[PDB]
């Protein structure tokens, strides 16, 4: 069984299980804004509310989950204050009232003060009826940016795929032991179970199409998931008033912050972070934007001896086809993602009178995965 000190749930994997929906009543003022970003934005009174808050303390955030719930709240608020209505009227300074508690709550959690995927996907969800299983119709998110930003779709579908991969994560310890103990039949069985679980994860990703439409994602939701690294409209980054003196640059959320988007490449000995290509560095950098425990899990995989070198050594066609199945499944997940980015960005972007740096990254990530095959 996997170590609980990495905070992987036998059931939900890298998602946070049964996330806190409510902060202690001390924090009712934060909760009210995050619950109503749509309304407060469209009114034009979102910045008014934030600027009129008191500097609350983080010291009443006790349990890990209430701390994770706060970080999701402040991170939604921060993106709303910075980006506004999403049409270019931008704030370059985050008020102490909010920047200070946020930067504190982050340092405690080892995360940066910007909304990351482990916020708005892994900790942003509830099951309506506890007894029923984790299907979309039984699920909701906790927070959103504008009406019809399709944020429910993009986050829950992401999350479901994360859950679909939990099944595969479960097996990783079975692999490394079979190598350590030289149990070949057992290793093959495992690689096949893992491959099946990613074929499953692909069918879940297909659900994307029912719950997101192109116009809304390109023009709206993309705006609120943008950060301030290499961004022209915030050339130097964000001032976190009262916590840091200078403005700091921080990246927008991306699929690259998903552990699952990394853990299997690493398991299979695909050197995504070596060699140093633009894409290679970007995946290494986003590891620092993951929960500390989850960054630790990936790093300790690089520490175990290579699954690729072992399979290559044995001259065993069954192990090769089995290893190939896991690699081919990942190629499917990258190819489907390429299809999604076409439908959801590049086409819309061609209708408004960055966009493509993302495609290169995935053509590279895919080409590096396809070249990691044997037969
Ligand atoms: C929809 C997609 C996403 O971008 N979510 C997402 C949601 C919110 C933010 C933010 N702020 C950023 C990102 C998710 C994550 C990637 C995943 C996937 C694709 C390709 N290759 C894979 C390989 C192994 C496992 C999963 C893979 C598909 C599901």
Contact (CB, 8 A) for 121 and 162: yes
- Where in the chain are the domains? 1-19+148-225+251-375, 20-147+226-250
DSSP of 121-185 = TTSSEEESSTTS-S-GGGEEES--SSTT--HHHHHHHHHHHHHHHHHHHTTHHHHHHHHHHT-HH
**How far, in Å, are 103, 248, 298, 358 from residue 353 at the CA level?**
38, 32, 42, 20
| Beta strands per DSSP E along the chain | 93-94, 125-127, 139-141, 239-240
Burial of 12 (0-12, 13-18, 19+ CB in 10 A): middle
d(CA 321, CA 257): 29
Test site for ligand 1: of 261, 279, 344, 369, most ligand atoms within 8 A of the Cβ:
261
**Distance from the alpha carbon of residue 164 to the mean position of ligand 1, in angstroms:** 12
CA distance 317 to 364: 28
E strand or H helix at 78:
helix 64-83
CA distances from 47 to 87, 89, 179 (A): 15, 12, 57
How many beta carbons lie within 10 A of that of residue 267, not counting itself? 24
Is the separation of the CB atoms in 146 and 220 below 8 Å? yes
Report which of 193, 360, 371 is spatially closest to residue 278, judged by C-alpha positions: 360
In angstroms, what CA-CA distances link 292 with 114, 135, 205, 296?
A: 15, 28, 26, 6
* Residue nearest to ligand 1 atom 29, measured at CA: 158
Ligand 1 center to 207 CA (angstroms) = 13
Name the residue of 119, 123, 158 whose CB sits within 8 Å of the most ligand 1 atoms, as the mutation to test its pocket: 158
Our answer on whether the CB atom of 225 is closer than 6 Å to any ligand 1 atom is yes
CA of 257 to the centre of ligand 1 (A): 8
Report CA(109)–ligand 1 centroid distance (Å). Answer: 22
Ligand 1 in reach of 58 Cβ (< 6 A): no
d(CA 111, CA 67): 12
Distance CA 328, CA 142 (A): 35
With 0-12 / 13-18 / 19 or more C-beta atoms within 10 angstroms meaning exposed / middle / buried, residue 274 is exposed
Q: State phi, psi for 94 to the nearest 5 degrees.
A: -95, 125
d(CA 237, CA 283): 21
d(CA 160, CA 134): 8
Residue 348 tokens read as: 């819309």
β-strands 93-94, 239-240: how paired? parallel
Query: Who's near 139: CB < 8 A, 6+ residues apart?
Result: 125, 126, 127, 128, 156, 159, 160
Name the residue with the closest Cα to ligand 1, atom 15.
255
Question: Concatenated DSSP letters for 333-348?
Answer: HHHHHHHHHIIIIIHH
Q: Which of 311, 303, 271 is nearest to 187 (CA)?
A: 311
217 CB near ligand 1 (under 6 Å): no
- What is the resolution of the experimental data for this entry, in Å? 2.8
Report the C-alpha gap between 320 and 317 in whole angstroms. Answer: 5
CA of 316 to the centre of ligand 1 (A): 33
Q: Is 337 known as a binding-site position?
A: yes
């Amino acid at each position: 069984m996997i170590s609980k000190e990495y905070h992987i749930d036998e059931e939900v994997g890298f998602a946070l299980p049964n996330p806190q929906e409510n902060l202690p009543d001390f924090y009712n003022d934060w909760m009210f804004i995050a619950k109503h970003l749509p309304d407060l934005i469209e009114s034009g009174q979102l910045r008014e509310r934030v600027e009129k808050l008191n500097m609350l303390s983080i010291d009443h955030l006790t349990d890990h989950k209430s701390q994770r719930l706060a970080r999701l709240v402040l991170g939604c608020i921060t993106m709303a204050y910075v980006w506004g209505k999403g049409h270019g009227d931008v704030r370059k300074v985050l008020p102490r009232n909010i920047a200070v508690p946020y930067c504190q709550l982050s340092k405690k959690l080892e995360l940066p003060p910007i909304l990351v995927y482990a916020d708005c996907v892994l900790a942003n969800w509830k099951k309506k009826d506890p007894n029923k299983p984790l299907t979309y119709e039984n699920m909701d998110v906790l927070f959103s940016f504008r009406d019809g930003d399709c944020s429910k779709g993009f986050f829950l579908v992401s999350l479901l795929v994360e859950i679909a991969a939990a099944s595969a994560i479960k097996v990783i310890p079975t692999v490394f032991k079979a190598m350590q103990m030289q149990e070949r039949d057992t290793l093959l069985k495992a690689l096949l179970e893992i491959a099946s679980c990613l074929e499953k994860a692909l069918q879940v990703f297909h659900q994307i199409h029912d719950h997101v439409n192109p116009k809304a994602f390109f023009s709206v939701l993309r705006i609120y998931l943008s950060g301030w690294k290499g961004n022209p409209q915030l050339s130097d980054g964000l001032v976190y008033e009262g916590f840091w003196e200078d403005p700091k640059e921080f990246a927008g959320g991306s699929a690259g912050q998903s552990s699952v988007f990394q853990c299997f490449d690493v398991l299979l000995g695909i050197q995504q972070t070596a060699g140093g290509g633009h894409a290679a560095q970007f995946l290494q950098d986003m590891r620092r934007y993951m929960p500390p425990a989850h960054r630790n899990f990936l790093c300790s995989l690089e520490s175990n001896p290579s699954v690729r070198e072992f399979v290559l050594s044995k001259g065993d066609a069954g192990l090769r086809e089995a290893y190939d199945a896991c690699v081919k499944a990942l190629v499917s997940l990258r190819s489907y993602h390429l299809q999604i980015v076409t439908k959801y960005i590049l086409i819309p972007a061609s209708q408004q009178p960055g966009g493509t740096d993302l495609m290169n990254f995935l053509k590279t990530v895919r080409s590096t995965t396809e070249k990691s095959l044997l037969k």
